[PDB]
Design a binder for this molecule. Structure first.
Ligand SMILES: [Mg+2]
Ligand SMILES: [Mg+2]
Ligand SMILES: [Mg+2]
Ligand SMILES: [Mg+2]
Ligand SMILES: [Mg+2]
Ligand SMILES: [Mg+2]
Ligand SMILES: [Mg+2]
Ligand SMILES: [Mg+2]
Ligand SMILES: [Mg+2]
Ligand SMILES: [Mg+2]
Lengths: 131, 63, 273, 53, 86, 93
RNA sequence: GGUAAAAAUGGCAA
RNA sequence: AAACUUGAGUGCAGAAGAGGAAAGUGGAAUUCCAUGUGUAGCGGUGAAAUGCGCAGAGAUAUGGAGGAACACCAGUGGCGAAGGCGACUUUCUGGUCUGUAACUGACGCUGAUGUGCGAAAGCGUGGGGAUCAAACAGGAUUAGAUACCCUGGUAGUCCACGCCGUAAACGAUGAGUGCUAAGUGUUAGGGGGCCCCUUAGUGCUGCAGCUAACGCAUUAAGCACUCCGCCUGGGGAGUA
């Protein structure tokens, strides 16, 4: 059965991005909305919409394709997994693509990027790398 | 071709109905293939059990 | 049905016995018992004429109705009992009028089953009908050869014969031996197979148990002296040393047919065993 | 059973006979059961012959 | 089992009217079906295919009984004595 | 459960005997918790092939409703024994 | 439908 | 700790099926046996011969006995966890699919060790024995022929109950879940106007992507997460 909803989200994004789909819809969760909001904030995705469904909600993500159809998201990777959870200290926070990419971190200060985590000096679980 | 049973809205085949069954058997008594008859898959099965039941009761010939 | 003994002794090793689960009553009906003193293979002259019979456990004879001639009255099987005089088990049956008789217990006969004899009886195990009334392909037992004499054929444990065809006054039957023969249609037969089928499988186990059954030791002819047996004598162990193996009374005993010629039954026998 | 028609050649009747035998497929059946073919082989022949058809 | 007998079992063990999915109802019907196939298997001992269905039913009953004991021990204890399963 | 039984009686049977036969067998089909809904005589018909060296047979069809198969069992047992009934078949539906 | 039947062997290197 | 219904089950209304077990009933054919007709061969092969026949074969006609398997239907058709399952009838019994949305409310997934099932050959006990057929025996072929081919033929092939536990037991592809172009055929449904839509199977073709290549491609060998089994040069050796 479904074991990693976050990983599913990132794969759906990866798959839709490969085929250059404009939008994708996925089942919603609070964590997945937060991840989506960072991606829009960092300019990886155009827009995030939430639709109430009387179940768990639906997230609609609109993907960004640059001029010449160049993809703004090149790759996404799940770091912490149900099989093996990965945590880092603020000092040890990883840089993705030498700052060209981002790391999404779950911290006691909320789900945030690696830059904010180093700034706030708060470490946590490394959810994923997006570049 | 066309399925007789579908066309004529017949949903049950009686082994006792020899006259119907004689149309779907060859001159040698062999059961005709559904390609030649145009019978549907569901009705080829129904008809064929009926032919075997009819042959048992000597209503139709084995050969 | 077969119980296998553990090898606590060499005597009990490989010995098996019947469980006797089918037996319902352990004690016989007193009215139907008669004395049976042992003959030990000795005739009216007092001389041994059949070898290897002697001693064995004392036994009482149970009167059995092989005739099955009480017709039009239903009988209910009271019990299945052990009979020492035969391989099969026997069933005590009580007729409606209150007459009690013993019959050979067929396979699958049960206490409370109703058994009837006659022309109008149904084809069900334990019913006795004339061979005329019995359909082809029915397995039957306790078959008479002469009408009214009583059943003589297919009486042993697990015995049966099959009705093959009808030929006027005679009915064709296939016997357990494999012989197909004609029997007079008037002769009666009982429906079903004789019970106690596991009898043959019993491993006697030890010499003593044979002695309980009144079997005395068989001495081979080859370990006798010449004056005793044609296989007798020779220095050390000897092979048969003759064109044919011979009986103790000097007749060839391997393959030689002993059926007497010019017998009335010869016309009745269609196919030999 | 082909029966010779009135004013019909035996050779003409033979033509009718040959065709009836072909439709019956008795010849086809005879050749198949000349030698035993293992169950798996029989199933394969049925499938690929149908694929041809 | 017959739909009649099944319906009787649901009414006996239904937690509320209109309840058809409570562990109690599901366990009870499963208990009946297991017994019926066990009966079939006594006569037909070499019906391996049917026994496999029985094995799946036993496991489904076990998993529901596990869930019920986890959730309500009293409800569990009452069900097991009523259905005579243990 | 409703069962439709079809049996063929030999063509050489006497009419009075045949009437007695059908009465017995149709009686059997109503013996145990069973009700004969209908019984019909198709009559003498040419058999497609010879059965028991007979080229014709008297066909009888009975429809019976029961909660058990005891009556249908008793029919089949007695039909086997009978020399009058050359063929028989029981169909649930 | 076919089908003619038989029909062996030959150092490692370069 | 308290909720929720999407997963997973249950109910309700439908659907198809060589799924399984046990009885019973058929028809075709083979073999044998019995008679009638009849006559000098039949059978077999590359060619022969062994064999069978003249003590009447083979062939033809009719009758009987017995065992085994079910033509046609029949189809990358159907069903099953796999092995497998094909005449028909009845009884008992397992699973699956569609729709609906009564109910339950994460009750799920995987699965070491366990525990069962498991083609064929084989083994034990009892039964059976038509056909075919290891071994074996003739004939032939050949340099030889412990083979291929021919005539025979035992175990075995069949049934019951135990045992064995293995196959290129294969899709050489572990299970679960989600996601990712299309086109076309077919099986069992559902819905709406022959057409369109849809669910679950089963095929073919073919993007993206993947791959050493061959190829795979919504029935992944693509993109992902969970759990299990397994691999680390060849031989020795699946041996001690
Ligand atoms: Mg003696
Ligand atoms: Mg001496
Ligand atoms: Mg002497
Ligand atoms: Mg001597
Ligand atoms: Mg010596
Ligand atoms: Mg060389
Ligand atoms: Mg085997
Ligand atoms: Mg050979
Ligand atoms: Mg292996
Ligand atoms: Mg599909």
């Amino acid at each position: 059965t479904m074991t990693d909803p976050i990983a599913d989200m990132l794969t759906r994004v990866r798959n839709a991005n490969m085929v250059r789909h404009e939008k994708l819809e996925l089942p919603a969760s609070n964590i997945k909305k937060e991840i989506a909001e960072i991606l829009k904030s960092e300019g990886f995705i155009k827009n995030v919409e939430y639709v109430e469904d009387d179940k768990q909600g639906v997230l609609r993500l609109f993907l960004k394709y640059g001029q010449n159809d160049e993809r703004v998201i090149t790759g996404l990777k799940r770091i912490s997994k149900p099989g093996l959870r990965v945590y880092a200290k603020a000092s040890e926070m990883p840089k993705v693509l030498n700052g060209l990419g981002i790391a999404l971190v779950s911290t006691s200060e909320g789900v945030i990027t690696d830059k904010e985590a180093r700034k706030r000096n708060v470490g946590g679980e490394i959810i994923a790398y997006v570049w | 071709k066309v399925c007789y049973f579908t066309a004529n809205g017949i949903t049950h085949i009686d082994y006792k109905d020899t006259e119907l069954l004689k149309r779907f058997i060859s001159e040698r008594g062999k059961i005709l293939p559904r390609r030649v008859t145009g019978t549907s898959a569901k009705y080829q099965r129904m008809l064929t059990t009926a032919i075997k039941r009819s042959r048992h009761m000597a209503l139709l010939p084995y050969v | 049905a077969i119980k296998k003994y553990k090898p606590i002794t060499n005597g009990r090793r490989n010995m098996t016995s019947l469980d006797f689960a089918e037996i319902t009553k352990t004690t016989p009906e007193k009215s139907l018992l008669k004395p049976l003193p042992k003959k030990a293979g000795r005739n009216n002259q007092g001389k041994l004429t059949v070898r290897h019979h002697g001693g064995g456990h004392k036994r009482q004879y149970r009167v059995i109705d092989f005739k099955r001639n009480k017709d039009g009255i239903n009988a209910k099987v009271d019990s299945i009992q052990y009979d020492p005089n035969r391989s099969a088990n026997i069933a005590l049956v009580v007729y409606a009028d209150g007459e009690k008789r013993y019959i050979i217990a067929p396979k699958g006969l049960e206490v409370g089953q109703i058994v009837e004899s006659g022309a109008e009886a149904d084809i069900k195990v334990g019913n006795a009908l004339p061979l005329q009334n019995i359909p082809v392909g029915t397995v039957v037992h306790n078959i008479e050869l002469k009408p009214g004499k009583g059943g003589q054929i297919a009486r042993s444990a697990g015995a049966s014969a099959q009705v093959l065809g009808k030929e006027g006054k005679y009915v064709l039957i296939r016997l357990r031996s494999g012989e197909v023969r004609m029997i007079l249609s008037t002769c009666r037969a009982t429906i079903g197979q004789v019970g106690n089928l596991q009898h043959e499988l019993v491993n006697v186990g030890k010499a003593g148990r044979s002695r309980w059954k009144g079997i005395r030791p068989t001495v081979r002819g080859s370990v006798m002296n010449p004056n005793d047996h044609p296989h007798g004598g020779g220095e050390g162990r000897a092979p048969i040393g003759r064109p044919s193996p011979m009986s103790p009374w000097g007749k060839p005993t391997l393959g030689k047919k002993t059926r007497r010629g010019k017998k009335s039954s010869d016309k009745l026998i269609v196919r030999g065993r | 059973k082909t029966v010779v028609r009135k004013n019909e050649s035996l050779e003409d009747a033979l033509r009718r006979f040959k065709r009836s035998v072909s439709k019956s497929g008795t010849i086809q059946e005879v050749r198949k059961r000349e030698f035993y073919e293992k169950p798996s082989v029989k199933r394969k022949k049925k499938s690929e012959a149908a694929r041809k058809r | 089992i017959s739909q009649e007998r099944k319906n009787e079992i649901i009414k006996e063990y239904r937690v509320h009217e209109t309840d058809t999915g409570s562990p109690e109802v599901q366990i009870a019907v499963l208990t009946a079906e297991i017994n019926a196939v066990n009966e079939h298997l006594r006569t037909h001992k070499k019906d391996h295919h049917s026994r496999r269905g029985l094995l799946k039913m036993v496991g489904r009953r076990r998993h529901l009984l596990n869930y019920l004991r986890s959730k309500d021990i009293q409800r569990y204890r009452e069900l097991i004595k009523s259905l005579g399963i243990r | 459960r409703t069962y439709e039984v079809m049996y063929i009686v030999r063509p050489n049977i006497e009419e009075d005997a045949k009437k007695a036969l059908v009465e017995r067998f149709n009686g059997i089909l109503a013996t145990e918790g069973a009700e004969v809904l209908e019984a019909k005589d198709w009559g003498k018909r040419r058999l497609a092939y010879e059965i028991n060296d007979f080229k014709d047979g008297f066909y009888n069809i009975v429809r019976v409703k029961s909660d058990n198969n005891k009556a249908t069992d008793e029919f089949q047992r007695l039909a086997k024994i009978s020399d009058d009934i050359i063929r028989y078949m029981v169909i649930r539906e």
